[PDB]
Design a protein around this ligand. Structure first.
Ligand SMILES: [K+]
Ligand SMILES: [K+]
Ligand SMILES: [Mg+2]
Ligand SMILES: [Mg+2]
Ligand SMILES: [Mg+2]
Ligand SMILES: [Mg+2]
Ligand SMILES: [Mg+2]
Ligand SMILES: [Mg+2]
Ligand SMILES: [Mg+2]
Ligand SMILES: [Mg+2]
Ligand SMILES: [Mg+2]
Ligand SMILES: [Mg+2]
Ligand SMILES: [Mg+2]
Ligand SMILES: [Mg+2]
Ligand SMILES: [Mg+2]
Ligand SMILES: [Mg+2]
Ligand SMILES: [Mg+2]
Ligand SMILES: [Mg+2]
Length: 150
RNA sequence: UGGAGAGUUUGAUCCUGGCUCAGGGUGAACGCUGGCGGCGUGCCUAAGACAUGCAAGUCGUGCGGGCCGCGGGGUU
């Protein structure tokens, strides 16, 4: 019902008297490839617990993507922190052209052909959040005319 | 009908930031190796110095001859 794929897994460390103590953080995307995505970042003392927790958080934070023939309706440009994401629709037969993080996010959303570009900071966390906010800032012609009814 | 990023400053993080790599290209060279064909291509340096051969001539339907040779005439 729901497909799940992790973006990256890292091991952070705090300092305590006697040595460093580790804590694992993991990004997880979940999607049905129908137009719904979810992104979660889980932290746990061990890796599998962190992956499961990131999956829970990703299912809790969902985004409805307005797909139009497997591509995006209009080009977007999002600044999350110092990271920038540039999304642009593409004609079918092109394929998802993106870095690992946006490729995974958009593929789990049900996108087949799109042109992206990461700018500024390449940080996978900020890039993931920028792509999520980009998909959250998408509008359709129906929504546009819905706003301009008056 | 058109756009992918990654490694690296820290105990860990975010940012700035340089360096490096994956791509394509070449009148290329070098190493190891090396079977055939087609089409291209081949002094990027000393515009340094050059043996040798060839590479710019042709018209007797513009003109008079030289040399060598043959034939026929004016003459016993
Ligand atoms: K902003
Ligand atoms: K690191
Ligand atoms: Mg929507
Ligand atoms: Mg900025
Ligand atoms: Mg930068
Ligand atoms: Mg860098
Ligand atoms: Mg320092
Ligand atoms: Mg270190
Ligand atoms: Mg410190
Ligand atoms: Mg190269
Ligand atoms: Mg190369
Ligand atoms: Mg040989
Ligand atoms: Mg040949
Ligand atoms: Mg030749
Ligand atoms: Mg040259
Ligand atoms: Mg020369
Ligand atoms: Mg005679
Ligand atoms: Mg007589």
């Amino acid at each position: 019902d729901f497909e799940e794929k992790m973006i990256l897994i890292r091991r952070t460390a705090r300092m305590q008297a006697g040595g460093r103590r580790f804590r694992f953080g993991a990004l997880v995307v979940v999607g049905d490839r129908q137009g719904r995505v979810g992104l979660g970042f889980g932290k746990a003392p061990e890796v599998p617990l962190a992956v499961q927790k990131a999956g829970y958080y990703a299912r809790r934070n969902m985004v409805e993507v307005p797909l139009q023939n497997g591509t995006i309706p209009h080009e977007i440009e999002v600044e999350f922190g110092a990271s920038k994401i540039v999304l642009k629709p593409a004609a079918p037969g092109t394929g998802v052209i993106a870095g690992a993080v946006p490729r995974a996010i958009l593929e789990l959303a049900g996108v087949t052909d799109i042109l992206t570009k990461e700018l500024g900071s390449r940080n996978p966390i900020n890039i993931a959040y920028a792509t999520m906010e980009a998909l959250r800032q998408l509008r359709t012609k129906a929504d546009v005319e819905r706003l301009r009814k008056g």
